[PDB]
Design a protein around this nucleic acid. Structure first.
Ligand code: NA
Length: 247
DNA sequence: CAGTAC
DNA sequence: GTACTG
């Protein structure tokens, strides 16, 4: 077909963006069959293709809830003090959701540990996680999983599921990042930056030293933020409900 | 870099 | 904006 439409068709594969699409085009590929049969695929790219149709589909809010509950149960079977919160556009209150993002913490602040690995394994045994895309054990005290799940039953679609385990001391800044929106986060962060601060999914910091050209050359002190409201407060911002963060 | 998460 | 792995 015409260039722009096939670049589109290719870019909707998870793991492939505009550079990969163009390369595939120059190879002569024009269809998804062309891709699965001739193209070099990362493991994740092969998964995105396998679930191409399902991944373009959005789910009802209800279905997200069901997904969060599946994750919640499995974790609580490990510790019931574990706090599990679906975030994302779901938290924001959207009718539909493109994926599901589940945040997991423990109030006692110690016990979120050793949960991540056993939680995924549990979900796999159930038949719930069907494929895995990415795992991060390398972000401090936060553990992140990107995978694919499917609820039990007839006529269920595969869904994109993120699971994140954070320590209670970071629960607030993490909750802020996973609820979003993405445009909302740039705004908070850019703002913090103008105020000599910095915001991440780990913590809000003050006394962040930047140099002449604006670049960050020293971190600051991390300010304790036990609640989302605290972050907003310390940035001189009227607190906003998740539903008001959908920018 | 490329792609991804929000 | 901040930050992870492919
Ligand atoms: Na894509």
């Amino acid at each position: 077909s015409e260039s722009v439409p096939v670049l589109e068709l290719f870019s909707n594969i998870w793991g492939a963006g505009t550079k990969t699409a163009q390369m595939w085009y120059q190879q002569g590929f024009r269809s998804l069959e062309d891709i699965r049969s001739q193209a070099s695929l990362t493991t994740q790219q092969a998964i995105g293709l396998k679930h191409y149709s399902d991944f373009l589909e959005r789910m009802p809010r209800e279905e997200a809830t069901e997904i969060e509950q599946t994750v919640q149960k499995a974790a609580q079977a490990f510790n019931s003090g574990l706090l599990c919160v679906a975030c994302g556009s779901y938290r924001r209150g959207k009718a539909t959701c493109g994926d599901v993002d589940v945040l997991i913490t423990h109030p006692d602040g110690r016990s979120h540990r050793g949960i991540f690995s056993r939680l995924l394994d549990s979900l796999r045994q159930e038949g719930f996680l069907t494929d895995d895309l990415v795992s991060q054990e390398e972000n401090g005290q936060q553990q992140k999983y990107l995978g694919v799940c499917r609820l039990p039953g007839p006529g269920r679609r595969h869904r994109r599921l993120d699971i994140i385990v954070v320590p209670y001391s970071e629960f607030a800044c993490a909750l802020l990042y996973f609820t979003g929106s993405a445009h909302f986060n740039r705004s908070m962060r850019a703002l913090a930056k103008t105020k000599g601060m910095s915001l991440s999914e780990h913590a809000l910091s003050t006394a962040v030293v930047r140099n002449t050209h604006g670049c960050k050359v020293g971190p600051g002190r991390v300010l304790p933020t036990p609640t989302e409201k605290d972050v907003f407060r310390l940035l001189g911002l009227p607190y906003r409900e998740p539903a008001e963060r959908d920018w």
